[PDB]
């Protein structure tokens, strides 16, 4: 600590006084991981390995809930031509928890895939499938030419070429109403400057790379704003109390000391907040008990030193710290320990005889180097 004061003051000589040095902070004893004991895996075989997808004008929307995800099977699959996320990293998906998950499944031409991304425009993004500017989620696609292409052209997949106005994010319009591009009104099936609104893709095995059919699944899930229904493949650990721990309760990551709380959460409630609108209590997601959350002790470290021209002996004040914490941080010899109202004072001898103040410690206490 004397070399720490010389370092902090940028000087090889230090005058008699009390100087601030790197803050004391009690470290996690162990981690805690808690999630509900759900087992069944999500419908990723029925979403990504389905026999066929719908046309882009009638894109399918499947709900994924009450299941465990395994995104290493999907991301590591060589069949996927792109697996690109816009509000999460693909490697974080297995280390992450999901509120609501929706799979949007449809087929488009590889040249049109460029319009599926958030913030885009053009006939696909404008008339059949738009993502929001701040889209959080992942776009997954693979070449399906062997599955969905025919030598004369598999025209069974359609898009929307005509529409009265542009559509909003995640709007789906299946309607086949005839569109009038000219100012003159029309009736029946077709006429001058009057068009059928949908158009078929020219899906042929002779098409160049980009002109071939790609199957697209877009995961448009939401994070950290509602009760979770899809989750990472994490095993729940044992739960401990009366110790400083790195806890995680259904994604509630933090470091603190857990204790049994008297806060009466209502049947619909799971997390408890303080006047500052921050979490101060949590109900365990598997065992229905409420734990009071308080972070570990920490504060500045003050070094008390006579002059360098006097002595190399120094004393250390752990500000805002209960003495209990010192042996926990196994000066650990002690036999000079004393709890002051400023914090835990170590390396200094407590003397009952009152003297005039020399080096100020705080809360009525002062130190000095004496015989």
């Amino acid at each position: 600590p004397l070399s720490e004061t010389k370092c902090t003051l940028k000087s090889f000589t230090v005058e008699k006084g009390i100087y601030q040095t790197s803050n004391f902070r009690v470290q996690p004893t162990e981690s805690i991981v808690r999630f509900p004991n759900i087992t069944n895996l999500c419908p990723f075989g029925e979403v990504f390995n389905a026999t066929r997808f719908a046309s882009v004008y009638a894109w399918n929307r499947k709900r994924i809930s009450n299941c465990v995800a395994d995104y290493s099977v999907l991301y590591n699959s060589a069949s996927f031509s792109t697996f690109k996320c816009y509000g999460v990293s693909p490697t974080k998906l297995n280390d992450l928890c999901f509120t609501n998950v929706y799979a949007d499944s449809f087929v488009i031409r590889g040249d049109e895939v460029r319009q599926i991304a958030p913030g885009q425009t053009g006939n696909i993004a404008d008339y059949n499938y738009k993502l929001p500017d701040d889209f959080t989620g992942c776009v997954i696609a693979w070449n399906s030419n062997n599955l969905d292409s025919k030598v004369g052209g598999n025209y069974n997949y359609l898009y929307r070429l005509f529409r009265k106005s542009n559509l909003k994010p995640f709007e789906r319009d299946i309607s086949t109403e005839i569109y009038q591009a000219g100012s003159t009104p029309c009736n029946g099936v077709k006429g001058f400057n009057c068009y059928f609104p949908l158009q078929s893709y020219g899906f042929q095995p002779t098409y160049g790379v980009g002109y071939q059919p790609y199957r697209v699944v877009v995961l448009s899930f939401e994070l950290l704003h509602a009760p979770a229904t899809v989750c990472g493949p994490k095993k729940s650990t044992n739960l401990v109390k009366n110790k400083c721990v790195n806890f995680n309760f259904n994604g509630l990551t933090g470091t603190g000391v857990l204790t049994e709380s008297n806060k009466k959460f209502l049947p619909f409630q799971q997390f408890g907040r303080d006047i500052a609108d921050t979490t101060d209590a949590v109900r365990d997601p598997q065992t229905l008990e409420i734990l009071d959350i308080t972070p570990c002790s920490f504060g500045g470290v003050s070094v008390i030193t006579p002059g360098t021209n006097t002595s190399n002996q120094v004393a250390v004040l752990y500000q805002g710290v209960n003495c209990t914490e010192v042996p926990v941080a196994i000066y650990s010899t002690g036999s000079n320990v004393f709890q002051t109202r400023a914090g835990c004072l170590i390396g200094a001898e407590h003397v009952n005889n009152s003297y005039e103040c020399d080096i100020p410690i705080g809360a009525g206490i002062c130190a000095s180097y004496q015989t």
């Binding site: 006047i275 500000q319 103040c357 705080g362 009525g364």
Partner: peptide, 26 residues
């Protein structure tokens, strides 16, 4: 005539003259 403050890195230091020491000078 506090807990959240210390929990967010805010530390309040005690005065050198306590509420009795200030009253003793008075």
């Amino acid at each position: 005539t506090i807990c959240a403050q210390k929990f967010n890195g805010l530390t309040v230091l005690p005065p050198l003259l306590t509420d009795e020491m200030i009253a003793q000078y008075t």
